[PDB]
Amino acid sequence: AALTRNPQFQKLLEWHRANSANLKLRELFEADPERFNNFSLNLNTNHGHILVDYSKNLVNKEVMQMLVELAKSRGVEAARDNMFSGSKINYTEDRAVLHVALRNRSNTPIKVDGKDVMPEVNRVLDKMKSFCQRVRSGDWKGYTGKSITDIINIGIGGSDLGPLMVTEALKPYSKGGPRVWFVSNIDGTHIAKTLASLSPETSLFIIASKTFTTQETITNAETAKEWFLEAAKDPSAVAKHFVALSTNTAKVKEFGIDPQNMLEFWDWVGGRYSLWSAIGLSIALHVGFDHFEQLLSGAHWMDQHFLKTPLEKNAPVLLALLGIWYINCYGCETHALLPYDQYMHRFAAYFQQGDMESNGKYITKSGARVDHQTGPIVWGEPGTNGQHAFYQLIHQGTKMIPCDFLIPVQTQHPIRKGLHHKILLANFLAQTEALMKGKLPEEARKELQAAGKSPEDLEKLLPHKVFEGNRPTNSIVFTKLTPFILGALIAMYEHKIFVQGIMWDINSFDQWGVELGKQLAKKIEPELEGSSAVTSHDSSTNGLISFIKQQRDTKL
Amino acid sequence: AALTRNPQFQKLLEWHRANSANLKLRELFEADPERFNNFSLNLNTNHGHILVDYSKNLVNKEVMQMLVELAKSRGVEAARDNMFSGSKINYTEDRAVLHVALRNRSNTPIKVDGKDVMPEVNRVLDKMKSFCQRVRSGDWKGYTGKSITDIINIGIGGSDLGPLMVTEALKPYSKGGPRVWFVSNIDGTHIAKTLASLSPETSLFIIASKTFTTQETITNAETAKEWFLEAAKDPSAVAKHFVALSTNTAKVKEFGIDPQNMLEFWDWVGGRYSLWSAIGLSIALHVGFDHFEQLLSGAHWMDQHFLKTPLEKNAPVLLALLGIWYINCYGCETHALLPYDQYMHRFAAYFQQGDMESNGKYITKSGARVDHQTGPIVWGEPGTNGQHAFYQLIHQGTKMIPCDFLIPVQTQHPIRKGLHHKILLANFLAQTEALMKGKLPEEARKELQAAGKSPEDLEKLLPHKVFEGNRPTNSIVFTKLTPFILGALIAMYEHKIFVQGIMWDINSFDQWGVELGKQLAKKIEPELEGSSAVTSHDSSTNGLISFIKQQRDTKL
């Protein structure tokens, strides 16, 4: 594999073997008073600041140098330029990778097969704006002539997580907008419980699916149509209550959607990089097109930062490099995203797809199997909640877990004269300090003595009360979680993932690994129908099917 | 450390070293048509069946025998009996561990300090029953004489995750009950957004906290009381609108609630094992006391299963052992919980606390520092959602990830004549089959051939289409997700966690690891006030504080 054969990697690895055990965060800060200054990036976007403080990491000047050199010798600069220019860097599918084009506010032409994609991008954006005016103003009428009060996005994966996460995060920007609902699971609970809260007269469905043949999405869409038609009793009324985000004109028409309300996107828009496209319709409907444009503008700002900035001070590049250090040298399986923001409660889940489906790969560009780790398992819950759930293990378990802590300085809800946010900030700060510093036996001993512990109880409790510390974190602090700043933040992680994939020599933009489960599911589906025993699989699959057939008739 | 010094563990590890490379799931299944029958448990609870199918794991008869021998040698059965009889097995806090007493439907005596706890457990349950009747019937009136429409649980961690996960999971059982809301984060967004949708006249607050000193919960409760009193203007009206669930009567009184308006629990109820106690009040209010009793009863059934069943046929024991195999022999950092059930959408998040806070430990009963792994990182999203997010990595990344797949046979919403559930089941079944089976180079080659691919296109695409398989899963399938069955499932995992903690020689029931973060946050709190530079910490904490102060008053 290219990474393992790379001399900059081998040097980094040998340095780790010889010196990593020596690295103590406490000592690193003690030896260097400029540590925060030299291991952080204060980004002024002109729409707020983003501070990426990576100083609480197990790195020094040499390590960062070794890491930047690796990025260079793995071709990160060339690959990035190739992405931005419309080159077909999705090499297994032979496709361009152009989520950057979707938010290319500068409108500098980006060509795919000799043709600028910007006119088409902007045409769909114009359609989205017009759509939003019609719906938000109440001008768009339902089949009984009433304004729309609820929007229901129906989609899976990239058609669901992005719009969900962003509408949750930008909820304060939704005054005057319709309520937004997300249906994704094929589990009939999801659509059934959504529809129970809705009126057919005032509900508008967005069916998000490029092919318009996605089984889960289309099944959900058809169930919605059936519920709708029970009330409307007129097939021509479907066009007032269903729109599509798709390129399959024929299938969309067949469903009963006016092809005017089919908003297009392109094969160079990956599902997990799609919220910036027509797929963001539910976002624009919820918060308004102006706020949607701001979100796009924030991403564009970060795209430019990533394109133009030298690697040593390039935010997504440094985030990528620190990850490579933890993944390929320390062997850390996971990466935690810990946003101290209740609005960002689905941020971690979003990057589970964005990161894991991108870089959960094992075949390189040459066709060779990797002989090293690739993408990590991404997880997290918002702070402070996580502190009362799993931080016990982060502080005192047996796992090394790189954590990104994120927070806005300014809250959307400065209640009680800022008291809640003061406490939230203090916890954000205290946790990374605690993870770094720990608590020494001498510090814990004084606490037990003051608590009045006997000699034997003291000695028994002492080791339990010690925190070893030396647990590395990033702290990412930003002025306020506005649409612009959120856009920047998402793009930053998109570009982190990109850099990591190049360094691993893998394709961040395909998803061949979802195919087998889809194939096998299609085979099992019709086998479940009848009463006959299924014997066509391994004994477990057969045994599980037998149990299902037996238990589905049981009356409880 | 006891585990690594144990000869049965040494035997298991050595066997793994010599032989585990030769374990191939596809081949195990082909060679043994009895595999499912011999590596699965079909439990009949008399209120539904639970099938625990562990056949798709990297084990054979010998491995299971060695694992069972290890559990015996690590004293699992004696430790279990000690838990059940009220021995103070939480040795660092010198406390009993008696969540099993909370659901002890048999009412057999369990003594702490020579005194049966059962009378007090049942007294509180009776008070819960009485209160729920008064509220749900509409008899309990607010300060303006209106029935209660909204219940708001305020609490965090163990006082939040259980009630939240259970009311979500048991949502079909809440018809006619009041709406329930969960406020947990200190982040002011959480309470602000919740209060925005409520009327003080018709809202009942439940303040849930073991200590009643938790910063987040007390601050939230004080904000709620301030909001309430702004409307009610009558301190005596607090008794109609606030109920406390605590062990700390004095702090409850201090906050401003009379013990009459307090439902108590006991120090031997760990926060993360507390939903079965007074803490489950919001569950009982939402779904009714009868359904809450059925939840307790299901846990009791599983308690009795765990207590009375030989190790080699004991469900939580076998799950625990498989985990030990993957954690301590294969070195897998994580464990994924993947319920194919939208109602169970918070099940994984609950067990992040249950598992990680219990077993994220590094000191043994002897005072030894472990030289082996302890608790895993728990994560997951419900299927099919998680399936469209991160399964790419599970199938084709570079991590071994033990997964538990869970599904009810019978759906709560059999819409479209069962079509949605049929598809859901097919996916549940196909994914584990796929993870087990994979797709060999020669199989993918033939598919590409049949697809009309050229030898040129075929050979470049081929390796990307290969699934190595041999990825182990558990499938846990149950008749229906009723309150009883859910109670049995939660207890099963509680006991898996217990068995693992015993085998690791750690205390599953303390949490010293959350203390440091709380202490450092209390120090940072006053430093945030005013405009002066903070220089008291490391340069990163100092620098983040400076950024916060600088950016506080930026008018975006």
Swiss-Prot record, chains A, B:
<keyword id="KW-0324">Glycolysis</keyword>
<dbReference type="GO" id="GO:0035902">
    <property type="term" value="P:response to immobilization stress"/>
</dbReference>
<dbReference type="GO" id="GO:0031625">
    <property type="term" value="F:ubiquitin protein ligase binding"/>
</dbReference>
<feature type="modified residue" description="Phosphoserine">
    <location>
        <position position="85"/>
    </location>
</feature>
<feature type="binding site">
    <location>
        <begin position="209"/>
        <end position="214"/>
    </location>
    <ligand>
        <name>D-glucose 6-phosphate</name>
    </ligand>
</feature>
<dbReference type="GO" id="GO:0035994">
    <property type="term" value="P:response to muscle stretch"/>
</dbReference>
<dbReference type="InterPro" id="IPR035482">
    <property type="entry name" value="SIS_PGI_2"/>
</dbReference>
<dbReference type="GO" id="GO:0033574">
    <property type="term" value="P:response to testosterone"/>
</dbReference>
<dbReference type="GO" id="GO:0001701">
    <property type="term" value="P:in utero embryonic development"/>
</dbReference>
<dbReference type="InterPro" id="IPR018189">
    <property type="entry name" value="Phosphoglucose_isomerase_CS"/>
</dbReference>
<keyword id="KW-0963">Cytoplasm</keyword>
<feature type="binding site">
    <location>
        <position position="357"/>
    </location>
    <ligand>
        <name>D-glucose 6-phosphate</name>
    </ligand>
</feature>
<dbReference type="InterPro" id="IPR023096">
    <property type="entry name" value="G6P_Isomerase_C"/>
</dbReference>
<dbReference type="GO" id="GO:0097367">
    <property type="term" value="F:carbohydrate derivative binding"/>
</dbReference>
<dbReference type="GO" id="GO:0006002">
    <property type="term" value="P:fructose 6-phosphate metabolic process"/>
</dbReference>
<dbReference type="GO" id="GO:0005829">
    <property type="term" value="C:cytosol"/>
</dbReference>
<feature type="binding site">
    <location>
        <position position="388"/>
    </location>
    <ligand>
        <name>D-glucose 6-phosphate</name>
    </ligand>
</feature>
<feature type="active site">
    <location>
        <position position="518"/>
    </location>
</feature>
<feature type="modified residue" description="N6-acetyllysine">
    <location>
        <position position="141"/>
    </location>
</feature>
<keyword id="KW-0832">Ubl conjugation</keyword>
<dbReference type="GO" id="GO:0002639">
    <property type="term" value="P:positive regulation of immunoglobulin production"/>
</dbReference>
<keyword id="KW-0964">Secreted</keyword>
<dbReference type="GO" id="GO:0043209">
    <property type="term" value="C:myelin sheath"/>
</dbReference>
<feature type="modified residue" description="Phosphoserine">
    <location>
        <position position="454"/>
    </location>
</feature>
<keyword id="KW-0413">Isomerase</keyword>
<keyword id="KW-0007">Acetylation</keyword>
<dbReference type="GO" id="GO:0032355">
    <property type="term" value="P:response to estradiol"/>
</dbReference>
<dbReference type="GO" id="GO:0060170">
    <property type="term" value="C:ciliary membrane"/>
</dbReference>
<feature type="binding site">
    <location>
        <position position="353"/>
    </location>
    <ligand>
        <name>D-glucose 6-phosphate</name>
    </ligand>
</feature>
<keyword id="KW-0312">Gluconeogenesis</keyword>
<feature type="binding site">
    <location>
        <begin position="158"/>
        <end position="159"/>
    </location>
    <ligand>
        <name>D-glucose 6-phosphate</name>
    </ligand>
</feature>
<dbReference type="GO" id="GO:0061621">
    <property type="term" value="P:canonical glycolysis"/>
</dbReference>
<dbReference type="GO" id="GO:0061620">
    <property type="term" value="P:glycolytic process through glucose-6-phosphate"/>
</dbReference>
<dbReference type="GO" id="GO:0005615">
    <property type="term" value="C:extracellular space"/>
</dbReference>
<dbReference type="GO" id="GO:0005125">
    <property type="term" value="F:cytokine activity"/>
</dbReference>
<dbReference type="InterPro" id="IPR046348">
    <property type="entry name" value="SIS_dom_sf"/>
</dbReference>
<dbReference type="GO" id="GO:0032570">
    <property type="term" value="P:response to progesterone"/>
</dbReference>
<feature type="modified residue" description="N-acetylalanine">
    <location>
        <position position="1"/>
    </location>
</feature>
<dbReference type="GO" id="GO:0051156">
    <property type="term" value="P:glucose 6-phosphate metabolic process"/>
</dbReference>
<feature type="binding site">
    <location>
        <position position="518"/>
    </location>
    <ligand>
        <name>D-glucose 6-phosphate</name>
    </ligand>
</feature>
<dbReference type="GO" id="GO:0006094">
    <property type="term" value="P:gluconeogenesis"/>
</dbReference>
<dbReference type="GO" id="GO:0042593">
    <property type="term" value="P:glucose homeostasis"/>
</dbReference>
